[PDB]
Amino acid sequence: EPSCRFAHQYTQEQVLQNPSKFINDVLFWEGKFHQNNISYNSGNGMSYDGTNIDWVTGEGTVKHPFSAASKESLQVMLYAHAIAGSADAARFLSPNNPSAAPGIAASIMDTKLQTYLRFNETYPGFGGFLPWFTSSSQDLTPTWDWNNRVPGLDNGELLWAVYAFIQAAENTSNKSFIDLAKKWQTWMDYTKTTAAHIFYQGEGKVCAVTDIKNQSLPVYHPEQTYACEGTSYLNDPYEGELFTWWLQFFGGLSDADIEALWEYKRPQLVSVDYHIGNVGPITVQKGYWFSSHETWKVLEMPYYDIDIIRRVFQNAERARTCNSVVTQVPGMFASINNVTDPATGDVVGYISNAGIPSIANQTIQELDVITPYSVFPTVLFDKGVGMAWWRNMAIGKKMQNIYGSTESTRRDGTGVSALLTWDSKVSTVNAILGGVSGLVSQKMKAENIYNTFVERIEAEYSRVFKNLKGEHVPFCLPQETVPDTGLVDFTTCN
Numbered sequence: 001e002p003s004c005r006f007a008h009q010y011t012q013e014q015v016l017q018n019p020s021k022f023i024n025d026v027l028f029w030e031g032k033f034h035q036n037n038i039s040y041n042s043g044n045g046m047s048y049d050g051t052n053i054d055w056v057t058g059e060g061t062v063k064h065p066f067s068a069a070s071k072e073s074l075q076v077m078l079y080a081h082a083i084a085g086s087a088d089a090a091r092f093l094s095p096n097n098p099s100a101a102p103g104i105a106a107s108i109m110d111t112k113l114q115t116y117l118r119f120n121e122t123y124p125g126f127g128g129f130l131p132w133f134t135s136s137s138q139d140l141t142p143t144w145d146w147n148n149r150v151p152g153l154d155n156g157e158l159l160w161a162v163y164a165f166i167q168a169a170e171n172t173s174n175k176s177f178i179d180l181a182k183k184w185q186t187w188m189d190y191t192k193t194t195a196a197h198i199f200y201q202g203e204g205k206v207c208a209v210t211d212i213k214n215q216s217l218p219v220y221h222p223e224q225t226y227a228c229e230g231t232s233y234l235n236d237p238y239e240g241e242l243f244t245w246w247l248q249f250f251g252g253l254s255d256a257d258i259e260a261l262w263e264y265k266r267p268q269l270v271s272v273d274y275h276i277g278n279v280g281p282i283t284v285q286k287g288y289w290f291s292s293h294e295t296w297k298v299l300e301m302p303y304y305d306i307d308i309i310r311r312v313f314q315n316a317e318r319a320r321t322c323n324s325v326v327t328q329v330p331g332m333f334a335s336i337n338n339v340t341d342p343a344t345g346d347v348v349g350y351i352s353n354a355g356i357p358s359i360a361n362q363t364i365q366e367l368d369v370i371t372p373y374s375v376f377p378t379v380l381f382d383k384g385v386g387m388a389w390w391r392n393m394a395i396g397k398k399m400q401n402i403y404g405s406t407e408s409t410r411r412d413g414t415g416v417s418a419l420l421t422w423d424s425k426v427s428t429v430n431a432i433l434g435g436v437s438g439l440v441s442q443k444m445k446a447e448n449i450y451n452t453f454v455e456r457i458e459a460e461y462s463r464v465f466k467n468l469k470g471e472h473v474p475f476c477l478p479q480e481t482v483p484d485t486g487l488v489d490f491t492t493c494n
């Protein structure tokens with residue numbers, strides 16, 4: 001089994017010569033993240049956002065006791081592959097006993113569902129959706145800030161992950177897995193009945209965050225109300241689009257309201273050309289920040305079955321990789337936790353605005369911190385190139401640990417986020433496993449919504465993305481290393 005510090009045991013060219021071998025090492029150590037008090041609570045089956053690790057030792061210290069439906073989506077997607085008997089998912093979940101992987105996934109998902117249902121019972125006002133929650137005790141509570149508030153985006157991610165898991169479980173023909181799947185189907189189906197009432201304001205406007213009068217009141221209690229928080233709507237092509245599809249297919253909207261969803265969204269779907277120095281022009285979908293995380297939706301629905309979409313998103317990775325070469329960055333950018341202050345052991349903040357400003361709606365960006373999970377969209381197109389970029393960042397001081405990759409490093413190598421999260425680690429894992437879009441596509445076809453998806457989304461993308469430039473620009477490989485400035489590898493992983 002591989003050394004903890006395997007990233008620098010390979011050369012870059014060796015990664016490209018045999019991506020699978022390298023990925024096999026990656027999955028093994030990533031899987032160590034999957035432990036009680038590190039990434040989830042085995043008592044209630046619920047994710048934690050992650051955990052801090054000690055500056056010197058690289059051992060788990062201080063967990064994050066909160067999580068959200070977005071991290072749930074990463075865990076559930078992993079479990080969908082695991083229960084289906086994926087050998088790669090087993091290398092993650094149960095490397096020394098692959099046969100146990102399906103049972104492990106089934107067991108946790110059973111415990112998890114029980115917890116979801118206790119939460120629904122105590123907080124029926126959420127209508128079967130999840131706010132940001134505290135998962136450190138047996139029963140979920142909303143985090144303080146998220147009492148009477150629920151986000152559409154995170155829930156959109158979870159729902160299609162559960163959709164995949166159900167399909168995966170039923171595909172096994174194992175009777176107890178099928179029974180588990182049907183209980184999850186019941187949970188998932190309940191959200192269909194509440195989705196429009198909670199999140200659809202009308203005229204194509206979908207709340208980013210819904211304010212609930214009182215989470216203790218049933219959805220249709222005579223005093224219960226739902227209203228959008230401010231004027232922030234799920235109206236763009238990023239992760240929130242998953243929730244749009246949920247409303248369209250299952251929400252009971254009229255044809256006019258479905259048309260209004262896409263009409264209201266249309267101005268946020270924009271073609272722009274990346275062009276810096278000798279790189280480009282490359283036509284891409286304009287990003288929010290052009291953080292890698294914005295591409296999440298392609299993990300969960302079969303966007304890449306549509307060739308115009310596949311081409312536009314392939315271009316994104318031409319731009320993302322080559323942008324880093326031309327601007328001399330030894331990694332790529334995504335929303336991420338900032339460095340740890342070694343004196344306190346605390347993360348100094350969260351950096352949302354990390355991406356590629358010239359092809360972004362939001363041009364005010366912090367670009368001093370890079371993260372391995374930035375490669376997840378690259379991995380979907382070219383796992384060698386993806387893993388080369390991953391390796392380049394992972395070789396930075398303290399950027400591997402006994403639970404796999406570390407959250408983030410400054411590109412100048414003077415600081416590291418001594419932290420593990422689902423977002424910075426298991427996003428990449430889910431990309432290595434090919435997303436769940438195959439499972440989702442199967443179930444969509446069986447429920448006769450696949451054709452509608454293709455027609456609508458091909459129409460929207462083909463209307464905006466014409467005469468692509470830069471499709472001849474090859475993906476770029478890392479040309480700079482993370483500087484060594486005197487940071488010392490974790491004593492358990494060196």
Ligand SMILES: *[C@@H]1O[C@H](CO)[C@@H](O[C@@H]2O[C@H](CO)[C@@H](O)[C@H](O)[C@H]2NC(C)=O)[C@H](O)[C@H]1NC(C)=O
Nearest residue numbers: 338339347348349350351352366368369410415
């Ligand atoms: C991420 O952490 C860095 C420090 O490591 C922050 O950058 C510093 O910001 C302070 C206070 O605004 C300045 O006085 C320093 O000059 C900056 N230091 C460096 C090394 O650039 C950065 O603001 C943090 N970002 C977030 C979002 O937390």
Ligand SMILES: OC[C@H]1O[C@@H](O[C@@H]2[C@@H](O)[C@H](O)[C@@H](CO)O[C@@H]2O)[C@H](O)[C@@H](O)[C@@H]1O
Nearest residue numbers: 070151153154209236238239240288294
């Ligand atoms: O706080 C609500 C919700 O915000 C989410 O942040 C969004 C981000 O993911 C998205 O890429 C951009 C552009 O649409 O908008 C928002 O910043 C965050 O991901 C969720 O976890 C939060 O619940």
Ligand SMILES: *[C@@H]1O[C@H](CO)[C@@H](O)[C@H](O)[C@H]1NC(C)=O
Nearest residue numbers: 120121124128186187190218
């Ligand atoms: C959630 O609770 C409500 C009200 O208590 C109930 O009507 C509904 O069936 C519950 N949902 C699930 C999936 O059990």
Ligand SMILES: *[C@@H]1O[C@H](CO)[C@@H](O)[C@H](O)[C@H]1NC(C)=O
Nearest residue numbers: 125148213214215216217218
């Ligand atoms: C919310 O509803 C519960 C159940 O009726 C009630 O106990 C509580 O006082 C209400 N909270 C507020 C802030 O009105």
Ligand SMILES: *[C@@H]1O[C@H](CO)[C@@H](O)[C@H](O)[C@H]1NC(C)=O
Nearest residue numbers: 267268269286360361362363
């Ligand atoms: C950012 O997006 C909004 C919503 O579509 C748009 O109106 C605004 O002009 C965009 N800003 C830039 C700088 O592209």
Ligand SMILES: OC[C@H]1O[C@@H](O)[C@H](O)[C@@H](O)[C@@H]1O
Nearest residue numbers: 049050064071337350421423
């Ligand atoms: O889930 C990744 C990150 O999301 C951010 O929005 C939260 O502020 C962090 O606590 C968390 O680590």
